Nucleic acid binder design. Structure first.
Length: 263
DNA sequence: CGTCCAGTCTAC
DNA sequence: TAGACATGGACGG
């Protein structure tokens, strides 16, 4: 559920739906507590884009589609297990909680938001979440400036391994990326975030917040194969690696000294 | 076999 | 903040 996976899911949606025409209503599973999507069109296309840990999906009526209406945008958050799949209409995956159906005359497929653990959410409207920082993958320069010009914010009092999960400043970084990034630099997880980032402005911490997830995207791995990602990892859950619980109870994997603020 | 572990969101 | 939110598989005692 991290940046690279949201970004590959956007790629997948755009490639799978490039020729497809969808029709009818947007079908939510009965168990899902997310909002019904009030969009219905006789002929519409689906496109996507990702920003940090959010994915914007746009449902665009084709010319002359009925009823006459503007496009509708939704924003998804994947939680721990969210994903998109394109399947035959009659072979729906289990836990397909939101479904878009191709219209005739093509082979009848379904584009599904699949979410086993049901932690993901979707909203109506295209707005990104207002507090989130810029995307480490696609807004690198804005993201770098938003960290550095704000180092006096209380957020950077926390250990660097906890600050990397703060989506106001590291939108797209999650639990495996913070392990892999700190591991490249041999920076102890529980050194203070402000102290680590002041010692700055050999790629540095903020550069690696971009280049490391970019590597995952280049694998096509964690994609929307699973072994090429398992071999790419150097720290997260790897043998020989230490691990501690941060203050919110998430496991930080690291090697060597845990740092001064370790619990 | 029973336990444990695997990003926001909510409410006290 | 602390626990909730929730399914399934690996891992033990």
């Amino acid at each position: 559920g991290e940046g690279p996976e949201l970004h590959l899911a956007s790629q997948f949606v755009n490639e799978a739906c490039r020729a497809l025409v969808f029709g009818g209503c947007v079908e939510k599973s009965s168990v899902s507590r997310n909002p019904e999507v009030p969009f219905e069109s006789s002929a519409y296309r689906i496109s996507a884009s990702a920003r940090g840990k959010e994915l914007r999906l746009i449902l665009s009526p084709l010319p002359g589609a009925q009823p006459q209406q503007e496009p509708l945008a939704l924003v998804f958050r994947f939680g721990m297990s969210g994903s998109f799949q394109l399947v035959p209409r009659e072979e729906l995956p289990r836990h397909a909680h939101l479904r878009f159906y191709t219209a005739p005359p093509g082979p009848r497929l379904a584009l599904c938001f699949v979410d086993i653990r049901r932690f993901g959410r979707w909203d109506l409207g295209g707005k990104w979440q207002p507090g989130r920082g810029p995307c480490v993958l696609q807004e690198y320069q804005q993201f770098r400036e938003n960290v550095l010009r704000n180092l006096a914010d209380k957020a950077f009092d926390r250990p660097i391994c906890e600050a990397l999960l703060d989506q106001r400043f590291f939108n797209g970084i999650g639990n495996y990326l913070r392990a892999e990034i700190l591991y490249r630099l041999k920076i102890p997880p529980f050194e203070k975030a402000r102290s680590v980032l002041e010692a700055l402005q050999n790629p540095d911490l903020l550069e690696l917040c971009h280049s490391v997830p970019k590597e995952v995207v280049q694998l096509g791995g964690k994609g929307y194969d699973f072994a090429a990602f398992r071999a790419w990892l150097r720290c997260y859950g790897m043998p020989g690696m230490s691990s501690l619980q941060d203050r919110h109870g998430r496991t930080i994997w690291f090697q060597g000294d845990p740092g001064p603020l370790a619990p």
